[PDB]
Amino acid sequence: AQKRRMRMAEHAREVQRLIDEKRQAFEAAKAREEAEDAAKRSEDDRVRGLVEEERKKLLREAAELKDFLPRGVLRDQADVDFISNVLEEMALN
Amino acid sequence: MREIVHIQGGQCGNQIGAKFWEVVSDEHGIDPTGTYHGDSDLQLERINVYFNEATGGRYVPRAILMDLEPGTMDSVRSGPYGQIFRPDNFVFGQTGAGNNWAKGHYTEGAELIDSVLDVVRKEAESCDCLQGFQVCHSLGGGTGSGMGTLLISKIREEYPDRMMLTFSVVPSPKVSDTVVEPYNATLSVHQLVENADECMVLDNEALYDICFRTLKLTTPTFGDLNHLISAVMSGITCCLRFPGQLNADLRKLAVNLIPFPRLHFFMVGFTPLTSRGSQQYRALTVPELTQQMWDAKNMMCAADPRHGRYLTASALFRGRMSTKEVDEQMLNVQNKNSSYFVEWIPNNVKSSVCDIPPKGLKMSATFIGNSTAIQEMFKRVSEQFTAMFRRKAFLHWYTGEGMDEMEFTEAESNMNDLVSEYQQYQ
Amino acid sequence: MREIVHIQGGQCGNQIGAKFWEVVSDEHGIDPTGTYHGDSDLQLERINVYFNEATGGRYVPRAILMDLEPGTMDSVRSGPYGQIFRPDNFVFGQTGAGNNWAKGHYTEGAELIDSVLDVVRKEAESCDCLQGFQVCHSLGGGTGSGMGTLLISKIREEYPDRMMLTFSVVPSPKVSDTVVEPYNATLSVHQLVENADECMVLDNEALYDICFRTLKLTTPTFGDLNHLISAVMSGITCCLRFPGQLNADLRKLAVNLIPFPRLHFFMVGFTPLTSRGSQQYRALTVPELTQQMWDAKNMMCAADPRHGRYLTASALFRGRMSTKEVDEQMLNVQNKNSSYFVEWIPNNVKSSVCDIPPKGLKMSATFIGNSTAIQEMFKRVSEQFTAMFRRKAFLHWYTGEGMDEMEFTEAESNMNDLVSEYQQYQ
Amino acid sequence: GEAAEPRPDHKSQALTYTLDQYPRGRLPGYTGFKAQAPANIDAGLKHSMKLPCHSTTSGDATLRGTQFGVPHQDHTHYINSRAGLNSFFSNSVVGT
Amino acid sequence: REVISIHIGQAGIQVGNACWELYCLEHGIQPDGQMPDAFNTFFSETGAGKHVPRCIFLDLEPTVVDEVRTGTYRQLFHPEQLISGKEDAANNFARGHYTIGKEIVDLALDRIRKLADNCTGLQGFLVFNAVGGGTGSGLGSLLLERLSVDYGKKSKLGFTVYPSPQVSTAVVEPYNSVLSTHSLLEHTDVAVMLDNEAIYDICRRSLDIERPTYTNLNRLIAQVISSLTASLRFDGALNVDITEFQTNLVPYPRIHFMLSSYAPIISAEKAYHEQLSVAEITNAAFEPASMMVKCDPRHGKYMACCLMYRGDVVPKDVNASVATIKTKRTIQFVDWCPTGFKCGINYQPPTVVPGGDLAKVQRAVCMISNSTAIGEIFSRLDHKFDLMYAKRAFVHWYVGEGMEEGEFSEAREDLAALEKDFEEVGA
Amino acid sequence: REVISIHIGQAGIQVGNACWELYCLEHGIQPDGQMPDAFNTFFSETGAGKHVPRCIFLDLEPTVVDEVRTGTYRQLFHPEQLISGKEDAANNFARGHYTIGKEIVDLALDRIRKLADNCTGLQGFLVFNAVGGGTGSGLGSLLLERLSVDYGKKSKLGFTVYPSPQVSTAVVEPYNSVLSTHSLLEHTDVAVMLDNEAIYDICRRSLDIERPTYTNLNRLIAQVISSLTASLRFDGALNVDITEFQTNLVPYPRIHFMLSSYAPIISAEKAYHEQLSVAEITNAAFEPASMMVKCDPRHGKYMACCLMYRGDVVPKDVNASVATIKTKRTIQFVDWCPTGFKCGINYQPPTVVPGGDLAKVQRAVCMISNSTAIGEIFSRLDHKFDLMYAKRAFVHWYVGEGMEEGEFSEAREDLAALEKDFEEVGA
Numbered sequence A: 001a002q003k004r005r006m007r008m009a010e011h012a013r014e015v016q017r018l019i020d021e022k023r024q025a026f027e028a029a030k031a032r033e034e035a036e037d038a039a040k041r042s043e044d045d046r047v048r049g050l051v052e053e054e055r056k057k058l059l060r061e062a063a064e065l066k067d068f069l070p071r072g073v074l075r076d077q078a079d080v081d082f083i084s085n086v087l088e089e090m091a092l093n
Numbered sequence B, C: 001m002r003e004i005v006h007i008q009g010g011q012c013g014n015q016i017g018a019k020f021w022e023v024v025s026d027e028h029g030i031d032p033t034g035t036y037h038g039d040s041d042l043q044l045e046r047i048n049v050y051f052n053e054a055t056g057g058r059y060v061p062r063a064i065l066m067d068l069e070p071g072t073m074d075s076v077r078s079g080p081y082g083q084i085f086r087p088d089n090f091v092f093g094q095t096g097a098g099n100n101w102a103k104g105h106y107t108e109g110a111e112l113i114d115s116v117l118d119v120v121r122k123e124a125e126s127c128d129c130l131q132g133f134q135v136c137h138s139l140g141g142g143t144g145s146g147m148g149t150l151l152i153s154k155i156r157e158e159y160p161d162r163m164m165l166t167f168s169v170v171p172s173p174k175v176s177d178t179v180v181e182p183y184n185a186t187l188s189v190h191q192l193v194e195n196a197d198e199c200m201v202l203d204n205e206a207l208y209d210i211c212f213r214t215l216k217l218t219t220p221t222f223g224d225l226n227h228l229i230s231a232v233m234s235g236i237t238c239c240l241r242f243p244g245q246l247n248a249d250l251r252k253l254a255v256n257l258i259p260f261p262r263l264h265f266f267m268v269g270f271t272p273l274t275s276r277g278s279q280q281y282r283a284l285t286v287p288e289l290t291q292q293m294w295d296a297k298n299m300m301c302a303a304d305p306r307h308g309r310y311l312t313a314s315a316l317f318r319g320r321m322s323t324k325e326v327d328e329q330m331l332n333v334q335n336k337n338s339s340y341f342v343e344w345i346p347n348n349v350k351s352s353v354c355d356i357p358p359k360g361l362k363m364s365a366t367f368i369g370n371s372t373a374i375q376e377m378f379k380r381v382s383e384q385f386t387a388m389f390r391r392k393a394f395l396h397w398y399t400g401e402g403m404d405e406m407e408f409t410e411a412e413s414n415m416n417d418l419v420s421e422y423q424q425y426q
Numbered sequence D: 001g002e003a004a005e006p007r008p009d010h011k012s013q014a015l016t017y018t019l020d021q022y023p024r025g026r027l028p029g030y031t032g033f034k035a036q037a038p039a040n041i042d043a044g045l046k047h048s049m050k051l052p053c054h055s056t057t058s059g060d061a062t063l064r065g066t067q068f069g070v071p072h073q074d075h076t077h078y079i080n081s082r083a084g085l086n087s088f089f090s091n092s093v094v095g096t
Numbered sequence E, F: 001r002e003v004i005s006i007h008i009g010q011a012g013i014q015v016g017n018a019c020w021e022l023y024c025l026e027h028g029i030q031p032d033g034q035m036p037d038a039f040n041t042f043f044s045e046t047g048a049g050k051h052v053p054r055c056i057f058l059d060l061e062p063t064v065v066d067e068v069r070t071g072t073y074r075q076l077f078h079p080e081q082l083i084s085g086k087e088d089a090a091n092n093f094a095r096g097h098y099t100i101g102k103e104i105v106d107l108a109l110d111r112i113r114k115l116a117d118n119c120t121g122l123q124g125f126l127v128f129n130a131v132g133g134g135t136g137s138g139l140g141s142l143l144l145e146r147l148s149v150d151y152g153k154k155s156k157l158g159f160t161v162y163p164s165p166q167v168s169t170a171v172v173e174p175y176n177s178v179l180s181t182h183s184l185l186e187h188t189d190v191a192v193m194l195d196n197e198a199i200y201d202i203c204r205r206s207l208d209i210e211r212p213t214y215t216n217l218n219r220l221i222a223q224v225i226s227s228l229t230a231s232l233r234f235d236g237a238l239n240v241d242i243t244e245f246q247t248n249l250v251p252y253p254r255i256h257f258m259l260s261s262y263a264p265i266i267s268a269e270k271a272y273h274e275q276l277s278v279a280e281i282t283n284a285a286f287e288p289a290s291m292m293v294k295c296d297p298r299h300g301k302y303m304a305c306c307l308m309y310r311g312d313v314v315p316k317d318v319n320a321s322v323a324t325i326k327t328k329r330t331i332q333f334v335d336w337c338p339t340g341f342k343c344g345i346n347y348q349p350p351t352v353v354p355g356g357d358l359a360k361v362q363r364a365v366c367m368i369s370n371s372t373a374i375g376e377i378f379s380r381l382d383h384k385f386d387l388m389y390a391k392r393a394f395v396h397w398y399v400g401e402g403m404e405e406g407e408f409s410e411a412r413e414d415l416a417a418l419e420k421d422f423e424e425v426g427a
């Protein structure tokens, strides 16, 4: 009785401690992938920051010829605000 | 270890090589200033295949720019990743050929190819175990075709054991820039069939169609076209640079796709290619990549593959993927499109898997089909060549330089016997 | 597992489908941007039927928009839940049919329908087990009727073993929006009885009567009509998306309601439908739903059923209900009004329950009756067709395009034998 | 350049999630949505309902049945083969 | 001794969902599958501290199946057993009998084969299906056919749900009932009918539940099955096996259709105000207010009856009560069966499941009888079958699947022959 | 007692990369090399607290070998053992047998010699190779023939990977498989086939893994190898050495090609739910749903069978189970062997790997049989070899490498002779 019962108990314990490790392994792998994803996303956002500053510089140098302009160069109202700000800065200059 | 020497010829070759070394440098994570800045260990162990550590971490490409006009060199040097080449590798004549195959193969090569051979030799014994050479040039230009073809001949004369890739673009009548396209392309093909090991044929017509249909670009400049071709070349040699669950080097692909020694002209396709507005509206699965691969509207030649049969085909996959899905998809395409394949060769699909995806993507694929639909393109050229040569148009620009009429007749003969033997195996 | 591909044609189909996907996404808890924001686990089990995960929580609807003028496309992209459709699923012509069934079926169909077939083909092979198709269109217009009906014919000869629902609004004299309504309706019904599995007739007159009496709305714009139609479509396919005590799939409803292959025109109703002013004084039990279901002023067609006889009928209940109460209620409603039912079919009412109510209510229902009174609507349209066709009015715009006269005589003959056999079984 | 720490074996590390061979407690049948995307995966663990719930009647009945558990019973009239018939046959003489 | 129970169709596995619930709640097994010997007939013990039921739920629409795969008993049931198709038969006998059956039943057979091989003292099978549907009728009969050709000599207890006369949910169920009965005749050894209108009336009057769903129906049906297998699980003063109904209840190899009943169906409050003894429940087992099939035995004559008794029951009063029944004349037997009863006594009372409305009774009776009112039911079904058939209604669906008129005509005349058989044995 | 293992080709060392991982996990050896006598047959104990395996990896492409050199098992393998050339053979038997073999084989066998001199009680060699490739085939065959001339008498177990019929990754693999077999006939002693499609089907069907990769394949191949050498490693009730397969399964000097199988291949949930015993796994190890080679032995007749039982096994029930197999008629034997079995029992159960998918089982069975279904396989490969050789396709690679049509035609007729042999013996 004792031998067989303790063998069954030990086997249940080992199976449980195995299932938990498999689950934890999945958790760890998913977390690692998520870290990689966050890294790539942050990198792309950083690149977008630079492209936005460059667009701002182009708009600053375009502010001078305000009256002669094509149809769409203002992406949004905030861009209109920026162009008016640089216009007033030119007026100050 | 295994070494790939790069050789670029002509204006097309130079600008193609510029975008190529741009994307390889991004893959290995080296900055435009030449220093390593990558993250993974994997990017360190296989940069000797393409670079040489000089001193202070300067990794210079193992490439040789070659042309006859400095305009292309300056366009290369102007953009970023232009100051990473060794200026000793800028072997460069001074007169300029200008769309004359006789100039690029008899007059100017006689004083330039010696210096090119010196540079490519010194660049060859600088590394230990050569895998082969890799040439990017055109068949419409003069200094690209003629000089590059003569260089191919001299190299195959000296080093007969190393492999040889040639990415050559062919002219198309729908996108026809120069007038002597047939006169140049026919003579170049005549020499490529006997000297080169395999030629991966490209063209601009199919590229423009791809960016119209799939990419939906508004202004497809040469930058995007060179971007696609570079993505092709990185895909074809990802196996050496990165470990995978099944590796396939250059010679391995050559023996799996060339059933006959003169049957070595491939058509290429690259996947995935999707518009930016729809890039997030799609899945990324192996069946999805395979549907985009085997679409006839995705080959990089102006030859509809459904007008002929594939002799062999190859698919190099990049990314962490399940091999079972890889082979079952290959089995599906070998069974569903069963008529489009040759009968006297079962298992016409070679496959390979690399474990590192290209930068920015999760999983990509490269298709290299050796089909018999390429004879349509050679007939599409040879009919123009015969139209002129029946009538000695423009012939004196070549006659008065040393080239005789027998060269043109021989080029007609080899073109015709090639398309006839492709027609035979169809 | 079981899959429903959705197809919207013409202006009526696009606007109705727009409100349809709004109701569906709100039931499945997906926000208009395209990410999951629901709570219940029941909502995740059955989104493979209507959506595909692309990457990163983005669920794209399995729908195809098909028209000829971009005005409907912009009305689709402007409203909420508009940015979710795949842009490749916007297959789309440019010219415009404009109330010409010949333009919808012979000239523009020959270049648009191969394209939409390829999109539908791709969308069908993307899934595993097709249950059926769901097509919403109109019968008065040209770009909806003729184009959609040809699409039905092509699909029915392509996948013959799959179900197909079609929701079509039909013309009425009191709601006469276009002038060639009979010339379009008669040809469309002629083709639908031979291709479509079953149709659910709709019209604007009954919807306006519903908004007048039951809803008591002040300004019933098209948004509210499409809202009612959307509620019905969600109600019928609720069974595939949610479990219940007695599941009844699309095919199970078809075989329970269609005694003969040509008698597949149903009239539809929806409950509960009360004004917000009276929602406070009302009760919500099965008898209160039934005595609003079987009322003639709740059918969404202009066919008074008490002027005919019911062949079969079906009720789809949603919400935690007691089936004894449901069934004894069906028995009582069949015994009381015993004359209005056919006699040689016992147990004329099929009933089914699902254990998920729609959002905003505790318990709802959907009535689908296959009555014989629909021959009044067909007789009403065929008499207008005769009045025009005896005198060759408006005919030459159809004749001069490729259509001939015997097509019209054929449509007359088939409508006449159709109303003859409805009257026969009555 | 100096590999002080050995490479972490990506070929085995990719199996459990990147190819999604590990099932998040799902039976070998159960044709349903797999949610093969990270945002949906992490949102699935925040589901309030968690499968069986008081919403569907078929689940709610079984839940109300197992609410209390197995209270108590007497095993007098339960038929015991262990008493009479399995007692005739014994295990190995030496012991196993 | 062991018996395996298979469930086919939407109603089958829902009843099983209540059935196995009651079983584990009787034998003290947690819903996860381990105890906190009488289970041996239903649950086989894998390893130690783990029990897996001898059953296979199978159906074609996966909705109700994966509802089970994801209910409370995910761990209790075993993964391979719960077979699921890909699409539904949709109230179409032919679609379930020829199209999809040919792919799914061979998997069911070589599954059930290794279930039998894992079993040791197999008493028989017992199948649960509703003939109104397409799955339970079509491939159910297909499975019974191939089971008969596989084993044959082993009993097959068929507890089927027949459609009610007036309360009905489907419209093609007369077609499905006739076609299924055509094969249930020569395959099923002992087939018990379980209607819905009768149970509805039981829940309405006795259980005083005015809004009952399918849950309460399946619960008390599961209660009857447990009361019927109690003799195999437990020891009593006089027990029967599953082969006993084979001999004691079937006089002719084609008259096997039994009327079932149970008593006392008593709520939790009426019992406190009422007295329980053997004589009144032996009476109450015969009145149609306690039957599971809407019919009138006053119009018919009984062939043979069976009486399972559970709980604190002595044999003297069951003997005296059946004596009073035989000497009474409100009910009459046939002239060819002088002794028309089959009694059986078991010690254990019926346990209750929490959430149900059945009281804890000291004793209970499960009656399984044979009569000719079933001949009246079959005639009433065949009449309304012929009404729809005279106009060839709905036939195009079956012939579109691949069937013809021959099996309709032969099934129609088969039930006519069964009608004549019932009338000639009744005389 | 010692046995050394060599690994050839791209597939070989990936198999070894999973197999040695299993050995260290079985003997409790940490990957750095030290335990925190049964191990002696695989690890030799250098220094103090350090065991270094009796293995050799060798390949022509250095990319996968130095992937091992940088992997987790840096310190475990002697730096010299891992042989690696300069450049790949590239799916070319002639290139990997005549041009590059001539410089690599001498370094290999002049290593293996000093490995054998380190050893004392060498049972034999066991080779891991895939014949489809160029490296696995060319210098594989070259190594085998130079080992046979060096030792001769010692057994050489060859675990080869043949290409699937319909699943294929290469194109010239028929040429390579035929040219490799032409020497595998008369050089190796005991050769076990294992395919990839059969394993894909196994992992999809039983293991319910819908997207498997090569790693899962290599994991259960290691299970098979470990299960057939565990008799040497651990003491069982009835042990079996490597010389036994040499006699008990090879009745003819040129008929040595053994099908392999394994049971129970089982997932994590199904295993706990079901009741594993000896009878059902003895059955399951005989169905083609669990063989490592895609072929149906129902078409063939078993020449000999060998059954390794691991774990929870008494000899009685295995004896009874093989009896039921012999008296069944679903499979038949040749008329030549009345005693067509060889059993073998070991006590230690099979171990599990974290990240592996197979649950722990009390007992497992690895069957190694011999039949004529392999005779069907070779004819299948011979058909599509003659298809490509009729058109002289791809031949210019081999001749320009240095070979001729002579060995092409003679390997063709060699497989023809083997075909006549199998057809003659099967009668």
Ligand SMILES: Nc1nc2c(ncn2[C@@H]2O[C@H](COP(=O)(O)OP(=O)(O)OP(=O)(O)O)[C@@H](O)[C@H]2O)c(=O)[nH]1
Residues within 6 Å of the ligand: C245, C246, C247, C252, E008, E009, E010, E011, E012, E014, E015, E059, E061, E088, E089, E090, E091, E092, E130, E131, E132, E133, E134, E135, E136, E137, E161, E168, E169, E170, E196, E214, E215, E217, E218
């Ligand atoms: N007593 C009882 N009867 C049920 C239950 N569920 C369904 N039924 C009956 O089953 C009959 C129809 O067959 P179903 O089981 O519902 O469906 P099916 O047999 O699986 O056939 P399909 O609908 O094609 O799947 C209906 O008339 C119901 O009366 C239930 O839970 N309890």
Ligand SMILES: Nc1nc2c(ncn2[C@@H]2O[C@H](COP(=O)(O)OP(=O)(O)OP(=O)(O)O)[C@@H](O)[C@H]2O)c(=O)[nH]1
Residues within 6 Å of the ligand: B245, B246, B247, B252, F008, F009, F010, F011, F012, F014, F015, F061, F088, F089, F090, F091, F092, F130, F131, F132, F133, F134, F135, F136, F137, F161, F163, F168, F169, F170, F195, F196, F214, F215, F217, F218
């Ligand atoms: N089962 C299994 N088969 C493999 C594995 N790796 C490669 N193969 C098989 O090997 C065959 C090709 O040979 P490879 O091992 O890839 O390459 P090789 O044998 O070393 O020959 P070379 O490519 O010239 O180096 C393919 O058909 C694969 O099926 C693996 O990890 N597991």
Ligand SMILES: Nc1nc2c(ncn2[C@@H]2O[C@H](COP(=O)(O)OP(=O)(O)O)[C@@H](O)[C@H]2O)c(=O)[nH]1
Residues within 6 Å of the ligand: B009, B010, B011, B012, B015, B016, B067, B098, B099, B138, B140, B141, B142, B143, B144, B145, B171, B176, B177, B178, B204, B222, B225, B226
């Ligand atoms: N795709 C692509 N094609 C190019 C590019 N530059 C030139 N070409 C093609 O090359 C052909 C002319 O070759 P050319 O530059 O004159 O060669 P070269 O004179 O010998 O150097 C034209 O048909 C162009 O289409 C480029 O950057 N990208």
Ligand SMILES: Nc1nc2c(ncn2[C@@H]2O[C@H](COP(=O)(O)OP(=O)(O)O)[C@@H](O)[C@H]2O)c(=O)[nH]1
Residues within 6 Å of the ligand: C009, C010, C011, C012, C013, C015, C016, C098, C099, C138, C139, C140, C141, C142, C143, C144, C145, C169, C177, C178, C204, C222, C223, C225, C226
């Ligand atoms: N209820 C409703 N009906 C509409 C809507 N748009 C158009 N219709 C109906 O469509 C009919 C005319 O068909 P039409 O829209 O011209 O079809 P099309 O031109 O082929 O797209 C009219 O009778 C309208 O009642 C809408 O948004 N809601």
Ligand SMILES: [Mg+2]
Residues within 6 Å of the ligand: E009, E010, E011, E133, E134, E135
């Ligand atoms: Mg059902």
Ligand SMILES: [Mg+2]
Residues within 6 Å of the ligand: F009, F010, F011, F133, F134, F135
């Ligand atoms: Mg290899």
